[PDB]
Amino acid sequence: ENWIDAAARDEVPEGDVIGINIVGKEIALYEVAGEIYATDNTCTHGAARMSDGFLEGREIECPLHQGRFDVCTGKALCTPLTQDIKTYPVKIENMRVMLKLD
Numbered sequence: 001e002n003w004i005d006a007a008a009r010d011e012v013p014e015g016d017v018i019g020i021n022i023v024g025k026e027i028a029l030y031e032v033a034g035e036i037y038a039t040d041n042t043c044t045h046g047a048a049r050m051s052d053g054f055l056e057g058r059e060i061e062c063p064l065h066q067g068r069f070d071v072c073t074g075k076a077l078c079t080p081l082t083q084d085i086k087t088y089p090v091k092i093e094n095m096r097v098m099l100k101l102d
């Protein structure tokens, strides 16, 4: 229901993040303690691409001004940020990463 095969599970590296372009949306995939999660690959604060980089635990650090989001809830943690980032449901199925894009 807007569910889409988006990547192989093992394309997302332990503890790190990757960027994908898919159906015209740029998306970040994250590996956090055995689970996969997803957000927009664009920082809400500026023209910054979250896939590069720095994921520490469940916190992703913007490469620009070091704003940080909780990857599981999309909530903004520290300044400069003011706006939460959009999250997308994922399920892992037969080694595939599925996304609910709206």
Ligand code: FES
Pocket (backbone or CB within 6 Å): 043, 044, 045, 046, 047, 048, 062, 063, 064, 065, 066, 067, 080, 081
């Ligand atoms: S651009 Fe990501 S914190 Fe300002």
Ligand SMILES: [Fe+3]
Pocket (backbone or CB within 6 Å): 056
């Ligand atoms: Fe640290």
